[PDB]
Design an enzyme around this catalytic site. Structure first.
Site, PDB file in Angstrom:
ATOM      1  N   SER A 290       0.835  -1.199   0.000  1.00  0.00           N
ATOM      2  CA  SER A 290       0.000   0.000   0.000  1.00  0.00           C
ATOM      3  C   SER A 290       0.871   1.251   0.000  1.00  0.00           C
ATOM      4  CB  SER A 290      -0.907   0.006   1.225  1.00  0.00           C
ATOM      5  OG  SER A 290      -0.102   0.015   2.401  1.00  0.00           O
ATOM      6  N   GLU A 295       5.807   4.314   1.700  1.00  0.00           N
ATOM      7  CA  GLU A 295       6.348   5.490   2.383  1.00  0.00           C
ATOM      8  C   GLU A 295       7.272   5.080   3.531  1.00  0.00           C
ATOM      9  OE1 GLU A 295       2.696   7.700   3.593  1.00  0.00           O
ATOM     10  OE2 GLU A 295       2.701   8.859   1.698  1.00  0.00           O
ATOM     11  N   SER A 313       1.020  -9.097  -5.126  1.00  0.00           N
ATOM     12  CA  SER A 313       0.638  -9.007  -6.529  1.00  0.00           C
ATOM     13  C   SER A 313       1.174  -7.727  -7.163  1.00  0.00           C
ATOM     14  CB  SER A 313      -0.888  -9.098  -6.674  1.00  0.00           C
ATOM     15  OG  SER A 313      -1.564  -7.976  -6.121  1.00  0.00           O
ATOM     16  N   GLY A 318      -5.330   0.277  -7.028  1.00  0.00           N
ATOM     17  CA  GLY A 318      -6.260   1.391  -7.032  1.00  0.00           C
ATOM     18  C   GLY A 318      -5.699   2.686  -7.588  1.00  0.00           C
ATOM     19  N   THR A 437      -7.367  12.859   5.858  1.00  0.00           N
ATOM     20  CA  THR A 437      -7.599  13.753   6.994  1.00  0.00           C
ATOM     21  C   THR A 437      -8.350  15.028   6.589  1.00  0.00           C
ATOM     22  OG1 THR A 437      -6.090  13.077   8.778  1.00  0.00           O
ATOM     23  CG2 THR A 437      -6.246  15.415   8.354  1.00  0.00           C
ATOM     24  N   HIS A 566       8.723  30.374 -13.872  1.00  0.00           N
ATOM     25  CA  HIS A 566      10.025  29.841 -14.275  1.00  0.00           C
ATOM     26  C   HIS A 566      11.110  30.402 -13.359  1.00  0.00           C
ATOM     27  CE1 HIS A 566      13.187  28.329 -16.954  1.00  0.00           C
ATOM     28  NE2 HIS A 566      13.719  29.540 -16.970  1.00  0.00           N
ATOM     29  N   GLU A 571       5.678  24.233 -13.890  1.00  0.00           N
ATOM     30  CA  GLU A 571       5.386  24.907 -15.150  1.00  0.00           C
ATOM     31  C   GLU A 571       5.304  23.934 -16.330  1.00  0.00           C
ATOM     32  OE1 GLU A 571       8.378  27.856 -16.815  1.00  0.00           O
ATOM     33  OE2 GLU A 571       9.939  26.974 -15.593  1.00  0.00           O
TER      34      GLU A 571
END
Ligand SMILES: Cc1cc2nc3c(=O)[nH]c(=O)nc-3n(C[C@H](O)[C@H](O)[C@H](O)COP(=O)(O)OP(=O)(O)OC[C@H]3O[C@@H](n4cnc5c(N)ncnc54)[C@H](O)[C@@H]3O)c2cc1C
Ligand SMILES: Cc1cc2nc3c(=O)[nH]c(=O)nc-3n(C[C@H](O)[C@H](O)[C@H](O)COP(=O)(O)OP(=O)(O)OC[C@H]3O[C@@H](n4cnc5c(N)ncnc54)[C@H](O)[C@@H]3O)c2cc1C
Ligand SMILES: CSc1nsc(NC(C)=O)n1
Ligand SMILES: CSc1nsc(NC(C)=O)n1
Ligand SMILES: CSc1nsc(NC(C)=O)n1
Ligand SMILES: CSc1nsc(NC(C)=O)n1
Lengths: 588, 588
Positions: A290, A295, A313, A318, A437, A566, A571
């Protein structure tokens, strides 16, 4: 329509005053309420196009048609003269505190949505109680007020992401002229954890101070809804009692899953324990795929850890699967190992955790691949990130009548109402809504305004933007590319895309064609932007603003006619031109 | 309307083919043109709502009404049979290279707009020449192809901004658990400059390779427009000659100003010399108050320099002055000194620059304050950032008839045309337009498409977003707060605002209520957002996306109904609620 609105508003408001902005008798009652510290909703009828009809419908409840009109819990209290009379006679306080119930509002759960709902409702006079309690993890971990994000979620995990990014700042600094040598700097895990935990502790405290300053009763106890208006509470010393409330908001959130294999609950940990772990994980195996799985693996590796991720897998089921794979490939090229199409069967313990010297234990993980090969390897720490689920059977006596779905989440209408008319659900337990959240805050705050201030505005759950804070970050808003093709057909979908490279990566000699971004658009609807995706530094800050444009229905021409800033990464979205159907390469 | 468009399109296009997507005779001519490497514009009449009338108007030029029709420089060349006949007979190449002039297009100036125009025009068959030449600075500094931004502007100055920010990364790393001690790390200026210059050198080279690959003649020589179609060129050996062109684009840009005081040109430097300076500036005095003045002072201080800025009147004249003052106050609290209401009278030299050991000279600056006090102080380096101006008298023989304004910039219509009908101006020399690199690119590219591909789309110059890369960055889009009050009256203006604090500043123990952001809105137009402003980290990436929403006319309700990404800085824009008229504080 007006009539039905005013009747619902009067029935649920705690203390509400109908008024006009330019009326001295309204001012007169306002000044009396402010002096005696009486909190209330106020609706100014001269700033509503509908206000002339409303001023006529108030005579259904009060038999008068002038302003001001004060109402308490569905009962008309008086015009100006009567309120002043109640005040002068020392009668006003006992009238506004009059109720069938102990509280106008009971919130079960003191997290993101719970505290947002509770604080907002108190502003309009709703006498409010917030209940919060943290069932410890299998090894006894626990924390203070604030819910998942604050204590074991978005906050400690982004700060550990920041410390992960600072390692590449140190690397980068050599090329920009600073004298240090990255290869002689190491990281101290417990020093990081102390600083993260200290900031969380000030959030715990800040929330308590917030509730006290809004006159919100805060109970540190487990809540059980036993009937529509009755909540049973068990406190820290197991003392059991009952409180009653007119409106009930369920905001209890979720907790992590464990795979049903031997050794898992005994010898593994979850994200619930990772963020205050007193020892460095060491050589670590992450079981799951997940955004939580990636993370956490991501920052453990950047802080010098030996890290493997075991993938059943696919990564990030999602999410746009091209974007997911770019995300995974970046991690693999910077020191995260992946064990693909692999499942665990067992965890054996080889060393207990060294509580005194703050050192991890040692574990043996046995698994198998789909091709037949056995998996067998030693790790000092095993983290499970294989899903999250609610625990409503511990909260909701099934005889109250709250309908749950097949996953145990609460079925609501689009204004958060459950199948029990005074009971609502917000946040991760609301079936079908993005588990985020800011969503839970928006839902709590808007609901509080509908209940106690006559508001009508609903929460909009579509096209909510997300960001995954992996080592290279990934931001999205709208449809993934495959889902859009699924919904409208390949012929009607045009995808613009391009690689890019941050100016900051030039002097630091980082990769050329790794960052990436695309716009998924519908041909038959003026090239409407259906989905936006970017993989690169600061992806959250990049994505946020475009979410506003997409909510207003931006097209490819709106992106084109705007001029870039820039030098920025963001951009590149204003000058895209290479389509996928064209077959031209997106590289620089 | 259609008629007038087709006549202008045919007259200016170099090689253009009218076609339909499903016609085998069009395919037949396309395949012939691709084989013989003939570049051209193509207009597919079956994808224009107007195409049936257009197919009828082509018989004004060709006396036929079928597709395909090929045109060269305003002359009808043939249908399918004639083009194949020209090919088979070895006649096609000499027909498409036929012209009154050497070039379809001459661009004077090889910067942001010049190269963008030149590359785009070549794609549609326009035989193109780009001219570029860098008049040295008073001390002889010079550089390669690419213009101001690439060589002495946005690029080297943002990289020196990055190295400035890395100093606070190093500081921050201690609090996040890394072992280094910032107070034992120093900075090496020349090592930084070598890395910056190396990246620029690959841009110089990349642009040359780009022009060669688009068949664009690149002349390294000074251009002088002597008549509408004649440009005189002087090369490096002073050899003088003339070339002719149908269309002319002026893109020569600007150069820095010097104050007319003794010692300034002799002993001061500008941004033109700063970015390749072979020695560290040392104790430095910046004379000026523009965004150039503050960005350069900003990074010199973060790299360990002793820095003073001399301010005549106000900071950042033309920007929101509250935002300017917040910007200035941040610099002052982090080691930049300000000499306010001060003007220089003289620069005396005390040491010549040490060419051999790479060490700065030493200077004495004499000035006075408006209160009477004298300014007298020693600096190793004095930088002038007191404006920029064009030098068109060196480019434009006044007898050609190009109208200039009182500042020497070219007066154009909204499609960039000058008072001479085949001559155009783009970029910093176009009077009244924002002086920015993405603007000049958009203007060049769109103009090239109008000239040689029949496009109609104009460049939109309104509500272009900007960012100032001072140590704490400042991003804006739309009206400043004072200008909006000026235009619509204070009563019709509502300003929402809030302080904030990046999550990353928590553990690093940085300031609480310094970052800031506001929305300036119009009450009588559904709370339309007239201007957005944010002061904080990554301000450019934050601001960009909102520019798209503002271009589509976003209101305060559009900001409210969008949900934030958490944890980010940019999400504070989605939940703003404190107005200025209310008097409530914006702090956390
Ligand atoms: C590792 C991780 C990282 C995340 N990162 C992000 C991110 O970057 N961005 C983002 O938007 N979201 C993120 N999330 C999700 C986000 O934290 C949730 O969407 C949010 O916390 C949901 O809020 P809530 O109020 O619905 O529930 P919670 O915040 O979980 O609050 C529920 C509270 O009620 C308590 N409670 C439960 N039962 C009872 C009871 N019977 N009586 C009393 N109290 C009870 C719980 O212990 C808890 O304190 C992350 C989640 C995880 C796990
Ligand atoms: C210090 C500084 C920082 C900046 N930072 C930014 C920033 O962050 N973002 C941003 O958007 N903008 C920034 N700018 C502005 C930006 O660089 C300009 O808007 C842009 O360069 C304008 O492009 P141009 O093509 O109009 O002119 P230029 O880029 O200046 O190109 C003109 C070229 O033509 C040459 N030339 C002149 N006369 C002749 C002649 N007779 N014959 C041949 N060649 C000739 C010039 O030498 C030059 O090479 C900055 C400018 C400065 C000075
Ligand atoms: C729900 S995502 C997920 N569940 S198990 C897994 N990986 C394994 C078993 O190796 N990923
Ligand atoms: C994503 S990993 C990484 N290292 S430096 C960086 N980004 C910058 C310097 O803007 N990212
Ligand atoms: C054009 S902005 C500017 N010009 S002179 C200045 N400052 C001084 C003379 O001390 N600022
Ligand atoms: C602007 S000066 C400065 N130091 S750290 C920072 N920003 C982060 C860490 O996001 N800014």
């Amino acid at each position: 329509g007006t009539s039905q609105w005013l009747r619902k508003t009067v029935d649920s408001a705690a203390v509400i005053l109908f008024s006009k902005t330019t009326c001295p008798y309204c001012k007169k009652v306002k000044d009396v309420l402010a002096e005696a510290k009486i909190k209330h909703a106020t609706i100014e009828l001269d700033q509503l196009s509908n206000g002339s009809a409303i001023q006529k419908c108030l005579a259904s409840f009060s038999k008068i048609e002038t302003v001001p009109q004060m109402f308490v819990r569905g009962k008309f209290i008086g015009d100006s003269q009567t309120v002043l009379k109640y005040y002068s006679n020392d009668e006003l306080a006992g009238i506004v505190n009059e109720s069938k119930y102990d509280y106008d509002l009971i919130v079960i759960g003191g997290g993101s949505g719970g505290l947002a709902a509770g604080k907002e409702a108190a502003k309009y006079g709703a006498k409010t109680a917030v209940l919060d309690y943290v069932e410890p993890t299998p090894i006894g971990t626990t924390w203070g007020l604030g819910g998942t994000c604050v204590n074991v979620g978005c906050i400690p995990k982004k700060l550990m992401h920041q410390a992960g990014l600072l390692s590449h700042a140190l690397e980068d600094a050599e090329h920009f002229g600073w004298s240090l040598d990255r290869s002689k700097i190491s990281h101290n895990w417990s020093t990081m954890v102390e600083g993260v935990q200290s900031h969380i502790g000030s959030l715990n405290w800040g929330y308590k101070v917030a509730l006290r300053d809004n006159q919100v009763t805060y109970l540190n106890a487990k809540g059980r809804l036993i009937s529509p208006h009755e909540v049973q509470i068990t406190d820290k010393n197991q003392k059991v009692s009952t409180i009653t409330g007119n409106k009930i908001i369920l905001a209890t959130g979720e907790r992590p899953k464990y795979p049903e294999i031997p050794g898992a609950v005994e010898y593994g940990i979850t994200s619930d324990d990772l963020f205050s772990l007193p020892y460095f994980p060491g050589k670590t195996l992450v079981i799951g795929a997940s955004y939580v799985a990636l993370e956490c693996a991501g920052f453990l590796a950047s802080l010098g850890g030996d890290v493997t991720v075991m993938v059943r897998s696919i990564l990030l089921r999602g999410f746009d699967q091209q974007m997911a794979e770019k995300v995974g490939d970046y991690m693999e090229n910077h020191g995260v190992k992946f064990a693909k199409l692999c499942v665990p069967d067992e965890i054996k313990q080889l060393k207990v955790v060294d509580t005194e010297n703050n050192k991890p234990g040692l574990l043996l993980v046995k698994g198998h691949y789909t091709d037949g090969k056995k998996f067998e390897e030693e790790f000092e720490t095993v983290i499970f990130a294989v899903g999250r689920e609610p625990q409503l059977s511990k909260v909701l006596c099934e005889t109250v009548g709250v309908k749950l779905d097949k996953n145990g989440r609460v079925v609501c209408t689009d204004d958060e109402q459950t199948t029990v008319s005074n009971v609502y659900a917000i946040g991760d337990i609301n079936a079908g809504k993005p588990q985020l959240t800011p969503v839970a805050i928006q839902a709590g705050r808007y609901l509080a305004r509908r209940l106690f201030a006559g508001a009508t505005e609903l929460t909009d759950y579509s096209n909510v933007a997300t960001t995954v804070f992996t080592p290279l970050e990934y931001g999205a808003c709208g449809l993934s590319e495959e889902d859009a093709i699924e919904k409208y057909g390949d012929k009607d979908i045009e995808v613009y895309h391009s690689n890019f490279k941050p100016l900051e990566w030039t002097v630091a000699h980082r990769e050329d064609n790794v960052c990436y971004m695309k716009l998924v658009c519908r041909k038959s609807d003026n090239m409407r932007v259906l989905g936006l995706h970017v993989l690169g530094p600061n992806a959250g800050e990049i994505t946020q603003g475009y979410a506003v444009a997409i909510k207003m229905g931006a097209t490819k021409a709106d992106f084109d006619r705007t001029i870039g800033i820039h030098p920025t990464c963001s951009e590149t979205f204003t000058t895209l031109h290479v389509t996928k159907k064209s077959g031209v390469s997106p590289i620089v």
